[PDB]
Ligand SMILES: *[C@@H]1O[C@H](CO)[C@@H](O[C@@H]2O[C@H](CO)[C@@H](O)[C@H](O)[C@H]2NC(C)=O)[C@H](O)[C@H]1NC(C)=O
């Protein structure tokens with residue numbers, strides 16, 4: 202619905218399930234840190250069904266011509282409970298949700314090793 | 317005296333080269349003496365093993381020479397100097413590794429038994445087709461479910477020249493098994509031993525479901541294709 | 547423009563994604579997902595055990611193919627830190643891999659030696 206307006210695209214980083222309250226969320230595009238005026242991240246509020254686990258948003262407001270050309274917007278999120286302390290989710294149009302899967306299960310007798 | 321050179325199976329599996337010169341159709345003669353020699357004046361190690369007299373009015377004897385591997389691939393004309401007074405000829409039979417043959421790897425194909433044999437229900441016959449080896453010394457060995465088989469349940473043929481390639485020789489190893497053994501899986505593996513092979517061993521397997529099957533029971537499950545993929 | 551999404555050479559699945567520039571308006575450009583799966587009809591259930599039974603059921607969890615459990619580096623303002631790329635992980639190998647050579651060990655007997663020699667289940671892989 203938002204891309205049909207062809208004005209702006211809001212990418213949402215859904216950091217949820219963290220029970221220590223404090224979380225750091227930064228967006229990067231092509232390995233460069235995006236400006237903090239581009240994205241706005243919420244204060245952590247408790248997850249509804251969870252007892253004390255929190256959730257946070259991060260809304261990156263990019264123009265639609267950037268997202269429809271297939272630019273990777275990476276969500277770098279830092280938390281204490283993470284094993285490597287930082288998780289990087291990336292999204293772009295090419296990964297997305299596909300609108301035409303074309304599968305070819307080539308059932309070959311003489312496959313053996315992949316080529 | 318038969319001239320039997322130790323093949324690559326001896327020098328690989330036994331880790332020793334026993335140069336045997338077995339006398340054949342020897343009418344019984346007391347004090348049989350066997351010695352071993354080279355083409356030149358050097359003498360390789362004489363025999364240490366002797367055999368008992370054959371009951372059919374004949375005498376049996378096997379020479380031996382525990383020479384090293386590297387002088388077995390030397391190529392000199394080693395001769396088994398059998399000391400005999402009944403026959404004045406020493407019977408110096410010549411056996412050596414021929415240097416002129418250029419190595420070629422044997423490829424093994426495992427042909428499953430034909431349906432015209434399985435419908436007869438007597439006994440299935442899996443054949444290991446070893447094609448294209450130049451040194452003419454293949455040791456085709458047969459197993460069953462990872463367990464090796466008896467040496468008499470399979471007969472490996474003598475190597476014969478290939479139809480197309482003249483310098484390459486081929487062998488046919490044939491294993492006869494019962495018909496209900498083949499229809500209950502029990503994957504038979506043919507393993508070969510050869511010089512030109514990389515690890516000196518190549519294994520192929522067949523069972524009921526692999527070799528020329530009448531059914532392909534493929535059940536593809538592409539689970540979770542609409543779910544997450546970066 | 548087929549970007550290579552996965553190139554899994556152990557289950558032979560290759561997934562590639564592209565934006566087909568189909569129409570003039572930039573929205574209906576279809577995100578196309580090309581799953582290319584080679585099913586080995588004769589490979590066994592355990593590829594490294596050649597005496598294993600024939601593999602009949604070929605299940606491909608496509609989320610398990612698309613996991614990226616190699617941590618990547620990211621450049622912060624003051625630090626470079628290893629960053630996990632997925633929450634999934636914390637291998638059937640229907641097919642052999644070309645780069646990987648698989649060896650099985652066979653019992654070879656001549657005079658009862660039982661010298662256990664390794665074969666090459668995939669020739670022309672480590673030669
Ligand atoms: C697949 O086959 C290989 C080879 O037979 C198995 O590896 C051997 O497994 C046994 C028992 O677990 C061990 O004693 C050996 O040391 C293993 N050898 C090697 C070279 O790894 C393997 O376990 C099999 N895998 C499955 C899932 O069946």
Ligand SMILES: *[C@@H]1O[C@H](CO)[C@@H](O)[C@H](O)[C@H]1NC(C)=O
Nearest residue numbers: 525531532533534535602603
């Ligand atoms: C075919 O595969 C299915 C998969 O579960 C199995 O249940 C069935 O027994 C198989 N049939 C044959 C004849 O192999």
Ligand SMILES: *[C@@H]1O[C@H](CO)[C@@H](O)[C@H](O)[C@H]1NC(C)=O
Nearest residue numbers: 303304305579580581582583
């Ligand atoms: C998907 O469609 C494209 C045509 O755009 C074709 O080239 C490709 O081979 C298809 N994918 C598979 C896995 O066959």
Ligand SMILES: [Ca+2]
Nearest residue numbers: 644645646647
């Ligand atoms: Ca490799």
